[PDB]
């Protein structure tokens, strides 16, 4: 559905950083689109939340020293059945905002055993 990314302090409530839209297989993959970004001055060590109001709640997925030019990358690690497994916040120098990218997990290696010729 809609993933609300929101930073927060230790005991106080959350402060929203953005809302992104997970769309399950329009024509291709489940890759995100950005609905709303938040131009809020944020600086310091904060707990980031990635709450989806329908499917998945994350009380805190990352603890980052956020700066006001938030040059981050919301990596949404997804599954085979296109459900949000994990959310993480990567750093990206050429980003200028918080853009959300869906990450599919890499196929693990398979060993080339001997075949029946």
């Amino acid at each position: 559905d809609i993933l609300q990314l929101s930073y927060s302090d230790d005991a106080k409530d959350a402060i929203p950083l953005g809302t992104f839209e997970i769309d399950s297989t329009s024509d291709g993959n489940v890759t995100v689109t950005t609905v709303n970004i938040q131009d809020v001055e944020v600086s310091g060590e904060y707990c980031l939340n990635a709450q989806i109001e329908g499917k998945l709640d994350m009380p805190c997925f990352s603890y980052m020293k956020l700066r006001t030019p938030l040059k981050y990358d919301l990596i949404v690690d997804v599954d085979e059945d296109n459900e949000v497994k994990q959310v993480s916040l990567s750093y990206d120098e050429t980003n200028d905002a918080i853009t959300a990218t869906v990450r599919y997990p890499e196929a693990g290696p398979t060993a080339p055993v001997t075949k029946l010729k």
Partner: protein, 142 residues
């Protein structure tokens, strides 16, 4: 309904009668489109001083001309063994019987050929017989 796998690791047929029975184990792992949650895994030991192990009460795929496969691992901390793995076919025929076949295989080779092709695996009779109980020789002389 449930199949039984016999076997015989002949240790008295090579004058290795002085041994510990618990250092040789026989593992069984189900493959080939089972119908349970987990595949069936068993591990037995010897039954007699002759060396005749036996797996029993194995769950099978109930259906006409339907197969259920088992990889048998005869392992021993004392001796090397000649068939490293044994594929077990448990085909429920329309014959009214339950055909048990066994195929030799070594470690590091697939058990079924590709659907495009084929080379077959060497058939095992039935008890079965892991031959060649020559010692494992851990110690390197220097």
């Amino acid at each position: 309904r449930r199949g039984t796998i016999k076997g015989r690791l002949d240790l008295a047929a090579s004058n290795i009668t002085g041994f510990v029975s618990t250092r040789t184990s026989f593992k069984l792992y189900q493959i080939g489109n089972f119908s349970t949650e987990y595949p069936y895994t068993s591990t037995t030991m010897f039954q007699d001083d002759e060396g005749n192990f036996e797996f029993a009460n194995l769950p099978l795929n109930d259906g006409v001309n339907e197969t259920t496969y088992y990889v048998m691992y005869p392992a021993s901390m004392d001796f090397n063994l000649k068939p490293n793995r044994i594929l077990i076919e448990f085909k429920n025929l329309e014959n009214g019987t339950l055909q048990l076949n066994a195929f030799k295989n070594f470690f590091g080779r697939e058990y079924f050929p590709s659907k495009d092709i084929l080379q077959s695996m060497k058939v095992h009779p039935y008890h079965k017989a892991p031959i060649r109980s020559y010692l494992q020789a851990r110690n390197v002389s220097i």
